[PDB]
């Protein structure tokens, strides 16, 4: 462990907290908290704070239901903007029903039952390490975003530099002051997009850094006048916005998916991790792409993947080896985009690839002759199938995958069919303003 | 109807 | 007939024209044409003016094509609106190719060739009363089209009133004048939006004054300082605009839908032709609706048809049998949209009927309980099937279908599908304003 | 739903 | 003092902060939900913890009691004329009077919590309301269940809202008055309800409850025009 | 490309 | 096509 009760309790009386957000997750992935005076931190660390848990499903939210708080001590974080008279600190906590029962219908929750499956197949570790891109954008005089990039920047390239402005350095420092441990950042092919990438860790606490993260990240951007998002795709014609995902599996604290005296480097269940996650690859893209906007950036040639297959070196694959082995071993989904809830996405990686291991799936051969110039019938006899096109028909594909089911719960599946049918629904029977243009003088 | 204020956001 | 050339050469003399249109219809259903002056009559009427005939293909043109410009006699009309120093006059033409074939790439001659099918069924005249509505929107000082409706009118209200402006009237009033044969109108459900009906004539003398309607309804408005646009839905939230297709088939000068003596005084013929149209009706929405716009008026809760059904009296059927009989006795098709090609919707309407006739299937129960009551689960297990909810799911649908490929042929079929295709694509990759107000600041 | 149009005026 | 402390901080930041029941049409309503516990010799009298739901007779009796008056004591714990825009379906107020431990949007919720905890929560009430006055009409409907022994009726756990009113009126469940005249009308005929507050304050009450109502069904609202001033 | 004046249009 | 993103600086 990190922190005990008596080390938060002299903590917050040093540094003098009077303001405590007991912070959650919902089902859309946004952070939802209840807050309470330092007052109530005993309270709290005795796990008897109530709140409603219907607020977890979201605006498809019925019913009012008690459920408690219980916090979770390695988490607590003292935010470094003073909120006038006392600082102010936060706990990540888990949802209990009020018979000490684990909620089901909270994503951290269910990730956590996901590695207690995980463990049950005698692995013990499952790492993760983001690569969360984002864009930003320069604020109006009424302080709303505006469509203008920040900077005419390139892949790689020292366009920030000295002088002032560089937010991304200044993102980075002070995610560094927060007890982040950040790997490397660089500008990204976009204008206006950069990367920054932490170091690999569990997979609970990668999933807690990246909700600190787009926090802090928006934060700070809105610190120096600008707008930082998540969007998968802001901008047509223009590359999007992905949060590649490298998952190294481990037992008896080495690495298991690395074999020196196999081909690739790689071990058998290396490659049945890979067959999981291409069998399930079509039937958990609505979970790693939830949004309407997701399936925009799902397109080819922006690097962004679009055909279910695994490569070591090729142009945009859906799986992606990279060069080092050792320790370093790992898989890489390059489907997955910033806006996905990454416990849900956590799961159901973890999920599709425990699938591979039960069963002993046979990956396929891997794909290194660009696939984009053959045509799509011209590669269907082959391995490669399309991941879906738009969110409806990536529900349509996750609703019929059983194992993709259970990887939730039921609780968490009707709940987020529900919500993402609404709001397809509503985006299918709008009229964009690129119909008028196309068809209102035309017609 | 018998939900506006949860969906009134759409 | 109604002219001859003696008839048109003497008329142009007196009335001193000096502009000849010889306008055509391509594949997207935009009005062409090729001007001579009036010098080259005697050519034009030789069947001896040449042009590209890839004009027709749209956008999709790949080579140039000479083709012959066959015009018809009995479509002269005469502008109203003189052009300065003489006036302007226009033949709608057929398409021939240079060795006297006529070309199968052009719906005109594709509709004639439908209705030859048709002959050779035993059948005399087939029968088109169009019911075209459209939406009139004002005009900014720069002269393009703004989203404020011209009245807040209702359902058959007297809202435009007397005392000026009552652009439907004047409209009325002009195509009187112009030789068109107008039933009647009335203000539409929307506000601002307006229907004119014709009297009943054959399919190519009903499409043909289609063609023209649009016109002169698009000059008109543009006389008043008004828009006026036949896009299916240009607004969110309001009806939409139908192009209702009465069809009637004539056997030996009578009606052939007519028979005292049957329930519903149907005949056979009648209950066949429905079978027909109901068994193609999701392989021809594509061509009945072919725009990405058209599938946004195909929602529930505007009267707009959603499922395939038969009816005499429902709420919103996708066939719909007026309480009129004897002579005027007919089947009404409600999904069709003013945006719709008139040549290629009749001719694949003509089509799914006569294919119904020629098989004597059997039609189904007619539904008179709103099917808008049960869910799509609880009716998908009688005969009502919904119609495709985008154009890619039409495209899908359409090219599956044997029968209806034959209803266009090969060329017009490649090159539809070719365009369509192409605006798909345009389409679903484009990031909507909606998208980036639902997800640039929550994510 | 099942009657917006009409009920638009509203 | 709340009320008064919220309103000048909000002052402070620039700011206006209001406790109208319901300021926006179309937009969820703002309420003053009571939780209710009795004590007898300094301990909880709602829990039982080997009956049903863990609740003691004591409590099915308040709950009876509080079932029983609902519709007449809702003029004091809605005293205003825009406290009846915020009781409509569909936005979690209130609107029937029954008793249920999850349902979307009951009269009275019995929180999951049990033990010294035990309470019961009534949800119609708004904070415009006169917090002595709807507590007493509340304690005095508690305490004339407690004192006859009513029997509660059971509880309600399948959407009342799915179903008609003419579906529900053969049950127990009854609407809300609709508008500050009804539960006016309500209020001076329930006896029990009468000296809960006394006949000073029940006059007083009425008089100015009836001026309010009367001021307002005379107004000519702005809807009216943009309804029918065009259209006739 | 091969087809840019005829599809410009989009 | 088949580079769009890395070419639009062009
Ligand atoms: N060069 C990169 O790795 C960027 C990846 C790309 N932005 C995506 O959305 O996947
Ligand atoms: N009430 C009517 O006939 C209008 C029909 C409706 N506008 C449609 O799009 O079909
Ligand atoms: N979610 C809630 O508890 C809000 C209650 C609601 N605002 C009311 O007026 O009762
Ligand atoms: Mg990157
Ligand atoms: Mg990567
Ligand atoms: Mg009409
Ligand atoms: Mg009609
Ligand atoms: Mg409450």
Redesign the interface.
């Known amino acids: 462990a990190k922190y005990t009760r008596e080390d938060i309790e002299k903590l917050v009386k040093e540094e003098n907290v009077k303001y405590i957000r007991l912070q959650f997750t919902d089902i859309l992935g946004t952070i939802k908290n209840v807050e309470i005076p330092v007052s109530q931190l005993g309270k709290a660390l005795d796990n008897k704070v109530m709140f409603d848990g219907s607020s977890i499903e979201g605006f498809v939210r019925i019913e009012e239901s008690d459920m408690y708080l219980y916090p979770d001590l390695n988490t607590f974080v003292i935010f470094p903007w003073t909120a006038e008279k006392g600082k102010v600190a936060r706990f990540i906590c888990d949802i209990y029903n009020p018979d000490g029962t684990p909620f089901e219908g909270d994503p951290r929750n269910n990730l956590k039952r996901i590695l207690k499956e995980m463990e049950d197949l005698g692995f013990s570790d499952f790492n993760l390490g983001p690569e969360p891109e984002f864009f930003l954008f320069k604020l109006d005089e009424k302080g709303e975003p505006t469509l203008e990039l920040n900077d005419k920047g390139g892949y790689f390239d020292l366009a920030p530099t000295d002088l002032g402005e560089n937010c991304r350095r200044d993102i980075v420092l002070e995610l560094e002051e927060m007890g982040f441990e950040i790997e490397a950042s660089h500008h990204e092919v976009a204008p206006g997009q950069h990367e920054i990438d932490f170091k690999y860790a569990g997979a609970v606490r990668s999933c807690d850094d990246i909700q600190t993260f787009k926090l802090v990240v928006k934060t700070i951007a809105r610190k120096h006048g600008l707008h930082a998002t998540f969007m998968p795709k802001p901008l047509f014609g223009v590359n999007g916005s992905g949060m590649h995902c490298n998952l190294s599996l481990f037992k008896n604290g080495v690495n298991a998916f690395f074999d020196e005296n196999a081909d690739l480097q790689l071990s058998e269940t290396a490659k049945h991790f890979i067959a999981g996650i291409v069998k399930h690859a079509t039937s958990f893209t609505a979970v790693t792409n939830p949004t309407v906007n997701s399936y925009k950036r799902l397109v080819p040639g922006y690097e962004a993947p679009c055909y279910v297959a695994w490569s070591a070196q090729n142009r945009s694959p859906l799986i992606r080896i990279p060069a080092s082995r050792g320790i370093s071993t790992r898989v890489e989904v390059r489907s997955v985009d910033p806006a996905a809830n990454p416990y849900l996405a956590l799961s159901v990686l973890l999920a599709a690839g425990l699938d591979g291991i039960k069963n002993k799936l046979e990956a396929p051969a891997p794909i290194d002759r660009n696939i984009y110039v053959m045509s799509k019938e011209e590669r269907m006899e082959n391995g490669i199938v399309d991941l879906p096109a738009t969110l409806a028909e990536a529900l349509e594909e996750f609703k019929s995958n059983e194992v993709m089911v259970k990887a939730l719960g039921e609780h968490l599946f009707e709940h987020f069919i529900e919500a993402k049918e609404i709001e397809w629904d509503m985006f299918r029977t709008q009229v964009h303003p690129w119909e008028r243009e196309q068809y209102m003088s035309q017609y | 109807?018998?939900?506006?204020?949860?969906?009134?956001?759409?």
């Open positions: 109807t018998f939900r506006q204020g949860d969906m009134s956001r759409f």
